[PDB]
Ligand SMILES: Oc1ccc(C(=C2Cc3ccccc3C2)c2ccc(O)cc2)cc1
């Protein structure tokens with residue numbers, strides 16, 4: 450599903 | 461309206 | 470104006486005595502279930518509950534000091550929230566199930582298409598159970614929903630909201646009085662007060678989602694809504 | 707064990723004030739939007755940039771990074787429009803009858819009429835801002851409320867979050883006692899503040915339907931990030 454939020458929350 | 465007259469009842 | 474002169478104990482007694490009865494549905498376990506009759510059972514049930522809810526509201530201290538136009542607005546905004554918190558309170562001692570009526574327990578497996586709203590109601594119920602919510606606290610929360618949910622939607626219609634805010638403050642005082650009499654320390658009283666009022670945010674959320682599902686059920690033209698429910702639903706255009 | 711529960715009340719206030727996102731600007735073109743396409747274009751662009759600051763703001767809310775990545779995603783997906791709206795209401799506080807979306811973008815309800823369904827949410831935001839102004843809401847209180855929204859709007863969608871939520875309650879009471887309020891005034895104001903969070907939830911639900919309708923209209927281009935934030939609400 451790979452959300453943009455997943456990436457942005459890591460940094 | 462139904463609610464109006466039930467309230468003033 | 471009686472409401473503003475009532476003591477905390479008189480406020481609790483006034484709310485408890487005004488409690489609506491718990492109604493039965495027309496459910497028949499022998500009758501085969503479906504996806505239209507079950508919502509038909511809930512629709513018929515909500516419609517009869519609304520008649521008691523209206524009479525309950527007129528016994529809520531301060532409600533009848535409002536004009537008829539404001540009483541209509543508050544009920545039109547809060548009716549589904551009030552039904553839902555009644556359902557959640559009714560279901561406290563039935564974990565994993567919603568007690569719509571003494572003869573109608575439903576778990577998540579029934580309830581078909583609706584399951585998201587069902588889970589939210591189940592979570593609020595276990596939340597009340599974890600907090601050990603008392604009946605004196607519940608009747609306060611339910612009266613808060615009635616006065617607050619539509620308070621932020623002329624000429625001197627500002628003095629009407631000032632009366633509502635003062636009565637709301639009176640209910641907050643009554644809530645603190647209940648917790649202090651239960652032995653809660655001052656920090657516990659404030660924390661529990663916050664916890665209870667935060668649940669009201671979730672109750673509003675479930676009502677907004679219920680209104681959308683009911684609007685969809687109407688446009689599907691399958692489940693017939695009653696004349697009052699149609700008008701109550703129409704208020705949330 | 708979380709570092710968030712070991713903070714004092716002052717440390718909690720300082721951490722939240724230091725995490726505050728900045729106030730962003732809209733486009734510097736000075737035409738007042740009266741089109742739905744021009745108005746929703748500026749608001750969507752604004753909100754898209756604000757979301758990037760919100761994500762990094764939330765990571766600095768005490769207790770938030772103790773959650774799993776999935777839990778962080780879920781809370782932000784549920785709360786993002788509530789957080790944008792309470793921020794809008796906050797900075798519109800000193801502009802009665804006006805919404806300050808940006809320092810160079812103040813909209814009145816006469817412009818909200820240019821989009822079907824917008825003026826209704828416009829008036830609710832206006833009434834909320836007027837409520838904050840009449841209560842003399844302080845910045846230290848605002849950031850406590852904004853954090854509560856982030857943590858509470860998606861809890862039951864848990865022991866850790868409720869402990870952090872209790873911590874913020876102590877912090878709110880700490881600010882009111884510090885401001886000289888009596889014991890009775892403290893719990894009454896606490897209730898008045900938290901009951902507004904019910905209306906903030908209501909406005910977000912109505913706003914989310916308005917953005918879903920705008921998506922189906924397909925005239926306003928939505929970013930992939932706003933699209934996934936919007937799609938999360940089913
Ligand atoms: O026409 C209707 C109006 C209200 C309802 C009630 C709902 C409760 C509920 C639960 C899951 C999904 C939808 C709904 C709506 C509901 C019914 C009774 C009650 O005491 C509380 C809520 C259902 C049909």
Ligand SMILES: Oc1ccc(C(=C2Cc3ccccc3C2)c2ccc(O)cc2)cc1
Pocket residue numbers: 746749750751752753756790791793794807823824827828913916917932
């Ligand atoms: O793509 C968008 C995402 C969010 C918005 C914001 C809304 C605020 C608002 C007010 C009335 C009707 C709809 C909406 C949405 C909004 C924008 C900025 C902000 O600071 C707060 C809310 C608008 C477009």
